[PDB]
Amino acid sequence: CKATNYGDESFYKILLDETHLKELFNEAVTPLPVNKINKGFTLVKMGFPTRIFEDTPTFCSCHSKLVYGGYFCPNCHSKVCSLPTVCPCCDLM
């Protein structure tokens, strides 16, 4: 935990009761702050699909299963059942 977190020793936690364990698990949900000297800045290409409402079912490009409604990708028009997921065709989030 220490050598892997730039020497910080606060990432190895030992509980003292069941109540504290829930707190320890909950604390991990929040994003972990990044280190200054670890720079990975970049731009990620992702699109915002538009929901549809069709009368008849159609096959989904992700599971090959018939689903009534889905979101159309703005790059290849393939439909995905749920979000957020990587498009199964163009690999665009």
Binding site: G40, F41, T42, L43, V44, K45, M46, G47, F48, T50, R51, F53, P74, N75, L92
Partner: protein, 293 residues
């Protein structure tokens, strides 16, 4: 089945309503909306005897709680009506009297921006207070916004509204929006209703507003699942660019600040967090599709 709490976020401001009167042929249309609200709240009180009502007015220089009045009277409503109804309506109209007088004194004050965000946030806090204080109560929000007035910049409104959407969703507090004005759709308020199982309605004419209120925005939280909402518009859940300002279908977002960018920012640097992107990596996006030579 169970008592429900109704919190009406009415956005009243002479600038918003005066423009509505000028564009149309109706003078003093605020009375018609105000009169409809009084009957609408009474209708909600008539649904059950254990339900409460709250009204928050977003005036030019801030927000104020019309009902319940703070612990810190003119005759405007007949005294022969039901006691509970008058106990709320009389206070509601009286606060309107005081609020207009306060607004009139500060008429020359510069109203830089709208205060709808605060009222919606304030309403959610009131909803939380009642739910925990009384123990097993449902909640609902109703936003009466006058969009006729030409807004200056709506971008600031985006962040507070999105935060309110998550809070309402967590607390199971559907929020309905009733819009009176020129613009047919509000990209933010309409988005709020869909994401929170609410009802969005737009009416051009103030007259006959009660029919809409009693027929569309009268679905109590107890029977929400069994009633199909009358909303007609559709939402794309898209956000405008930070430089062009247009809706982006496919674009780029910064890894650090999550700022949408339709095109590569000038200077190869983020315009929102001043983060420099790698020249090689951005060149990857710039590469054109592969085609046989």
């Amino acid at each position: 089945e169970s008592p429900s709490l109704l919190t009406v976020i009415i956005e009243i401001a002479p600038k918003l309503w005066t423009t509505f009167d000028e564009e149309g042929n109706e003078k003093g249309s605020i009375i018609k909306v105000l009169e409809a609200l009084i009957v609408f709240l009474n209708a909600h009180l008539a649904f059950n005897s254990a339900n409460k009502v709250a009204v928050i007015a977003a005036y030019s220089q801030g927000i104020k709680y019309l009902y319940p009045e703070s612990t810190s009277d003119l005759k405007i409503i007949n005294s022969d009506m039901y006691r509970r109804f008058r106990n709320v309506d009389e206070t509601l109209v009286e606060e309107i009297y005081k609020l207009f007088e306060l607004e009139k004194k500060q008429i020359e004050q510069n109203s830089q921006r709208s205060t709808l965000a605060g009222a919606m946030s304030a309403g959610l806090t009131y909803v939380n207070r009642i739910s925990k204080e009384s123990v097993s109560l449902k909640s609902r929000l109703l936003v009466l916004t006058c969009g006729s007035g030409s807004s200056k910049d709506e971008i600031f409104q985006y962040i507070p509204i999105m935060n309110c959407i998550f809070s309402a969703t967590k607390m199971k507090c559907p929020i309905d929006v009733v819009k009176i004005g020129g613009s047919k759709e509000s990209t933010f308020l309409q988005q709020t209703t869909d994401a929170t199982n609410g009802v969005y309605l737009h009416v051009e004419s103030t007259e006959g507003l009660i029919q809409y209120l009693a027929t569309a925005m009268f679905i109590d939280p107890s029977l929400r699942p069994i009633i199909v909402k009358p909303n007609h518009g559709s939402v794309d859940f898209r956000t405008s660019c930070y430089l062009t300002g247009r809706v982006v279908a496919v674009g780029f977002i910064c890894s650090v600040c999550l700022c949408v960018l339709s095109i590569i920012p000038p200077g190869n640097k983020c315009p929102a967090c001043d983060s420099q992107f790698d020249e090689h990596v951005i060149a990857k996006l710039k590469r054109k599709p592969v085609v046989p030579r």
